[PDB]
DNA sequence: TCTCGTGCCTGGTGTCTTTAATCC
DNA sequence: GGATTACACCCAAGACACCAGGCACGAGA
RNA sequence: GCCUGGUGUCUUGGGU
């Protein structure tokens, strides 16, 4: 309803398919190639095309429309770019799995070291779960220390002995045993070397390794083109009004972009080889700490302020990250909070609500034939006299703000419109005290509007909330539709909660003064 | 295919507290959007009150589709389910 | 499910063999070597 | 090229339409929205079969909005042309760049480099025509062409023909 | 727990999430298959036909 | 907007170029597969319609619906006014008039005779009825798929089509 | 030749220090047995040292505070030597980008170079104000626009030739600035012309009020909101803003509190 | 509205209320997805009424979703780390 | 510009002692110029939205760097009421 | 009038060595 | 011998890059 | 003559 009409059919999500983004697909969804780390054109307003704030990526400004979708900043989701890497680098998240794949396949042609002829191995391919199957296979093939050219009849092997691959930070070392004891030469297994080997893995061996030909193809664990997130993921902030600093990701993408240009600057002229290894490893470093800056065994990337860079991995974990802080719980509208006081002369299921709170909260009541006369009275009283109203919402969604409407007397209400009226007697609201240890921490009470600024509770409900009146505060939530009002009154209401399933007995009784006095 | 024939319905013939709450709210919502009301409205003009009045006279024109764990389902009309 | 979780946890929040919270912890953590 | 297709349409109904003739309203609603419209996936939907007896099923109530969703399964006569299909036509216009031919709902353009050299546009004749000696292509003349390419605008589809082949032309 | 590790591992093995849990639907903001959401509500076309004719949709 | 029984079409590893509609190569796309399914899940052969069948069904459906609109009370220009809206008026009138000038068997007596005569892929059987031909030489050129089938009767097909064909 | 890792920016210092040590020990019983040392700008953080024995490399760097203590030296191949010592444009009529001053970042045509060979005369679209606020930086400069001599004539100028004026001690010919820049102050390589370069080349609110009827009679206030008939006075006396009808107010003016004749 | 308040509404079985709190009363957002590849890669000009997923060359099989803004944000952060979260609106088994 | 009233500021940009103020009223007006008329941006300080009282005293001076420097002290009186906290 | 020195602004880039218990 | 785990919500006050090089302006000879 | 944006990251002290 707050969304403008769109002819596309509305549906819900039934399935989430995870997987990797192929290099080809990243380019197919990208709307611009990103090359220059200089954000501004030349510090003379309007940001530079092909730069990190290219306007095709989107608008985070109220006055510039998106040059891709034409929508305002509120509706525009943002569109991705892409950044071509001069040399393929590892994805920091997938290194230990890459390492596991090397011991499974031939480091020349890439074929699975065992066949259905091996009886125990033929049992292991039957395992239905992809992860367990892959592990069961690797548990067998680990001890197979040579890729056989011949069946244990050629299997497609190349005859080479296989190395023992070891991880050393962001680098993988493989030690080959050249054919008693002689001298073995461990050379570095670069990402580019491993990349070519992975593309030659057959479709039939791709499945047997627990990967998936359509969604998680194993060479896509190596990064060749980086998706550039739109500005909505990395907004700018203004420290002291006319001074704006950039998000940690914006600075870090500049570093990757600068480092990318210097790899192009090497292969065409003065490369003293030992310099190529220092510059390529540094590109690997920046791409790693851009995604995960908690890599064990090496120093963290630091901002010039000295504090560590906020990588994407750190954005999602922990109490304040995206999942625990914004999705499993979040801040909400139509809520209120204040100190509580008791009142014996309120019914059990009532809550006394201060007038000032009752004028700020609202409920959008739909206008019908049975209440249109009643609702017009609220409109004339306006936002400052109780009982009154704050907005009139048409079916198109335009709100009329009754603070600034000087011709309030000339509004005629049509059926189907909405009036956001003040909170009023017997409206159900959800009442709540933290910590919410059990279900009777949230019960529905009936509002009674009262002077003075505390919430009033009948005294017999202090026990289930484990509330008292020594400074405690409690929270109130106002349902915003006809469906949830009915859910509150018919499922969560106080009298339904008198007996608790915890110990098949009541959790409310007569207490304190009234209990002392009744004896 | 998935639908279970009327003679072979096995789920409970009483309206559950969850089914009751959803029926009252949905019907209330439809009345506030000016759906035709099937009972006489006297003095009680709140949307929730009219819907509760219709429930008490077995006059709510809705069908519960109760999903079973395998995905099959029994359709039960609110006219035939017994309300305590 | 949720009702079960709250019904067991709430009494624990207000409470020579090991008893109370340290013993409860051994169970859920199904420790191989109990105290 | 005509087919019979079993189709379906998702219809959203506002609660104020919940009356005893609900199904009859929906039957009228389906026809008004579907008849005469074109899609690239099926073609032109010419007429729906057995409109007054369509079984609409039961409507799903949308949580949070009150409106009702019907899946109206139905059967229609559909018309989609195809690349490679040889068809007859009736010419609608003649111009220096070729001609336009009405094949039922839509119009097909045949360009000049795919028209044989001996068919010469003659404006001085009354009435204007593509003429020969025993051939006569005036408006309404049966001509036989072959559809060599289909382009899709998802609103109206556009097909390009050719008479640059054997046995195609006036008859 | 192990939030990021689960998701990396889920990608590399192309896991399918069938969205039947409460937590799946809560974080995607969809009505969860529990309590008042454990069933669908349909409109009884048969019972509407017992109403008089002047109530009819045109 | 409007959808069908055929669903999903999720991505596969190997692409396909047997999808591009080519009547010569019997590629009718994913919606017009040889075996379709109706709205109950039952299997069903693809329904391709000749010009003669289609003229009877469409005209019948319009006049039965027109009679129904009249509570139960021939010419093409009169039959097209049953539709609602000038956009609908156009497409329906043009389709009848087009069929009015190219349908050889314009009545149900001859049409049922053609129906029984024709009733082996279902698409080819429908093509032969739509495109009039004189001899066997003319049929396998314009419709080059009839080449390597080695089952004529073709001549007696064309003779019966032309004999049932009224003069003009 | 060995390479050695050193603190960034300290490569020249290390080369210097090695020379001092070499020269100081010449002819003694413990000469520094290196032949040469050098540092290439293109190769940040490295010094290269020429010798016959690795021990001499350790000797050259011993005690040097700019060198990383880790035993990080590396050997260079003979086939890589000359590339280490590779030494490596600008033509009249070509474009360059200015690197300094208010014209920093601007595209300019090379008009000519000095006889000695250091500074080049550039043709530039000016960024001028015609002395408008006189009694400059690159962050507080002016927009680019061709010099207009009639505008200068009107507003604030020496004619020197056909189409040539000296204005505020700079030369403008046919609208362009001609100004000398150090060659080191211009960029000649990998210039990317920009899009822009391709195009070119109620009367009682907030007034104090007294209330003359009602329970708040005699109190001072300020009109906070005057939508219609019902005013919002922010009373002074208790911290409350009240709704009040217009019949009840006196407004202050030049002479006292005046009724609704103001 | 923290994690512990979420659990209380589950115990009450008030599924409808919980949905509304976390969407309509907060950060509700509309996105478009491609019916073929399941990504949020649709370019939607609503005044021109034209939609296209360029990758699938698909202008017809396109759906709209209502999801939390913070979930939309989450998926774009996952895309930036080469993880593809494909949202499909139908099952298949 | 901010949504509150600017009518209590004097010409020096500072409010004077003795004037009652309510929430969102501007009490210190300050502007910052916009880089490249109609060149400045507001950088003023409003009273906290939940408060009221009387301006009591206004200090004007300069800081160590020589630019102008102000402090505005506001006083109000809090009277005990329902909900306030006390203890022996 | 010219040259030298000092100060301010802008651009580019780091480094002397110096809290405790659990399982997997 | 490695990390990961370590209640919930809320209020409020108190803070912010460094060094080097180049250019311009002012003062003194 | 409708729209109408004021920061963040920490640390410390507190409330139940
Ligand atoms: Mg307490
Ligand atoms: Zn956009
Ligand atoms: Zn091999
Ligand atoms: Zn797609």
Automatic annotation (TrEMBL), chain B:
Provide the species name: Komagataella phaffii (strain GS115 / ATCC 20864) (Yeast)
Mark the transmembrane ranges.
none
**Which GO cellular component does the record give, naming just one?**
RNA polymerase II, core complex
The residues forming the signal peptide are none
Question: Would the keyword Nuclease turn up in this protein's UniProt record?
Answer: no
**Where is this chain's protein located in or outside the cell?**
Nucleus
What is this protein called in UniProt?
A: DNA-directed RNA polymerases I, II, and III subunit RPABC2
Q: Which UniProt keywords apply?
A: DNA-directed RNA polymerase, Nucleus, Phosphoprotein, Transcription
GO biological process terms on file: transcription by RNA polymerase II; transcription elongation by RNA polymerase I; tRNA transcription by RNA polymerase III
User: To which protein family does this belong?
Assistant: Belongs to the archaeal Rpo6/eukaryotic RPB6 RNA polymerase subunit family.
- GO MF terms on file? DNA binding; DNA-directed RNA polymerase activity
Automatic annotation (TrEMBL), chain C:
Lineage top rank: taxon = Eukaryota
Q: Where in the cell is it found?
A: Nucleus
What the protein does comes down to: DNA-dependent RNA polymerase catalyzes the transcription of DNA into RNA using the four ribonucleoside triphosphates as substrates.
The Swiss-Prot or TrEMBL record describes its family as follows: Belongs to the RNA polymerase beta' chain family.
Protein known as = DNA-directed RNA polymerase subunit
* Shown residues in whole-protein numbering: 1067 to 1114 of 1743
UniProtKB/TrEMBL annotation, chain G:
Where in the cell is the protein located? Nucleus
The keyword Nucleus appears for this protein: yes
- KOW domain: from which residue to which, for each copy? 89-116, 202-229
Q: Which GO terms describe its cellular component?
A: DSIF complex; rDNA heterochromatin
Keyword check for Cell membrane, yes or no. Answer: no
Q: Which UniProt keywords apply?
A: Nucleus, Transcription
A single Gene Ontology molecular function, please?
Answer: snRNP binding
Q: Tell me which Gene Ontology terms the entry assigns under biological process.
A: chromatin remodeling; intracellular mRNA localization; negative regulation of transcription elongation by RNA polymerase I; positive regulation of autophagy; positive regulation of transcription elongation by RNA polymerase I; positive regulation of transcription elongation by RNA polymerase II; regulation of rRNA processing; regulation of transcription-coupled nucleotide-excision repair
Q: Which family does it belong to?
A: Belongs to the SPT5 family.
Its annotated function is as follows: The SPT4-SPT5 complex mediates both activation and inhibition of transcription elongation, and plays a role in pre-mRNA processing. This complex seems to be important for the stability of the RNA polymerase II elongation machinery on the chromatin template but not for the inherent ability of this machinery to translocate down the gene.
Name-wise, this protein is Transcription elongation factor SPT5
Organism in which the protein naturally occurs = Komagataella phaffii (strain GS115 / ATCC 20864)
Automatic annotation (TrEMBL), chain I:
Give the subcellular location: Nucleus
Give the stretches traversing the membrane: none
Q: Which domain of life is it from?
A: Eukaryota
Question: What family does the Swiss-Prot or TrEMBL record give for this protein?
Answer: Belongs to the RNA polymerase beta chain family.
What is this protein's function per UniProt?
A: DNA-dependent RNA polymerase catalyzes the transcription of DNA into RNA using the four ribonucleoside triphosphates as substrates.
- Assembly: Component of the RNA polymerase II (Pol II) complex consisting of 12 subunits.
**Official protein name in the record:** DNA-directed RNA polymerase subunit beta
Q: Which organism is it from?
A: Komagataella phaffii (strain GS115 / ATCC 20864)
